[PDB]
């Protein structure tokens, strides 16, 4: 899958979560916010790595694993929103095209 396909599918899924899953996500799990010194896909994978068996984020984790083959603890719903906003900003900032 091309970089454009990777981003489109990930963004669509994140939008789906924010609109269609009830907060709190993953039984009130908390995760570290994304490490901005790292690659975005790998950083996102790392943030979610310790959440197991949460069906809400399962597809996101699956996608992130494929895209990454090699400051505050926050709720998962917040993490999902922040990741989505961060990816939109990166796109508006010409980092993908």
């Amino acid at each position: 899958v091309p970089p454009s396909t990777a981003l489109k599918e990930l963004i669509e899924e994140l939008v789906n979560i924010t609109q269609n899953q009830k907060a709190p996500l993953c039984n009130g799990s908390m995760v570290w916010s994304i490490n901005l010194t790292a690659g975005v896909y790998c950083a996102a994978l790392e943030s979610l790595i310790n959440v197991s068996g949460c069906s809400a984020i399962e597809k996101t984790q699956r996608m992130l694993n494929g895209f990454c083959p090699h400051d505050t603890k926050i709720e998962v719903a917040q993490f999902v929103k922040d990741l989505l906003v961060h990816l939109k900003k990166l796109f508006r900032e010409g980092q993908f095209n």
Partner: protein, 157 residues
């Protein structure tokens, strides 16, 4: 097809002369890349005013939406190009266009703290009461991003 790819490239790069040549030679003004971006999206995003003007005069779709629902106006507002915001509105941009998460250009101008762009958008009928898919109005966004002066302007309307 080759002309169209070159047009996307030249519009992004600010190559005024190349854009004029490609348009005169039949390039598709509304060419799309893999993300749904048009030459007008790229030129607006990158602050290329002359190119924005040329494209609009060639019939560019002022309200074309990319894969996240950005119109060129969203990108001009977010990237802080007042002059491009103004010309896009002049040529019929939808001041209240909503992206994939319901952000309007006013939301994005509030986010980056660009008061002049906020003011222009308001002058052209931007909806201060528009809520995005997170329940936030532009005034909420302005406060969240430490732009109290914008929040106050928006809250007085």
């Amino acid at each position: 097809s080759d002309l169209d790819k070159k047009l996307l490239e030249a519009a992004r790069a600010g190559q005024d002369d190349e854009v004029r040549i490609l348009m005169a030679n039949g390039a598709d003004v509304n060419a799309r890349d893999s993300y749904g971006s048009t030459p007008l999206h790229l030129a607006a995003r990158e602050g290329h005013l002359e190119i924005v003007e040329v494209l609009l005069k060639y019939g560019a779709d002022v309200n074309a939406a990319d894969f996240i629902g950005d119109t060129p106006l969203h990108l001009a507002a977010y990237r802080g190009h007042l002059e491009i915001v103004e010309v896009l509105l002049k040529y019929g941009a939808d001041v209240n266009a909503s992206d994939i998460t319901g952000e309007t250009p006013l939301h994005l101008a509030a986010q980056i703290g660009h008061l002049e762009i906020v003011e222009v958008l308001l002058k052209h009928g931007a909806d201060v009461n528009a809520q995005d898919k997170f329940g936030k109005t532009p005034a909420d966004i302005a406060a969240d991003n430490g732009h109290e002066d914008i929040a106050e302007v928006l809250q007085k309307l």
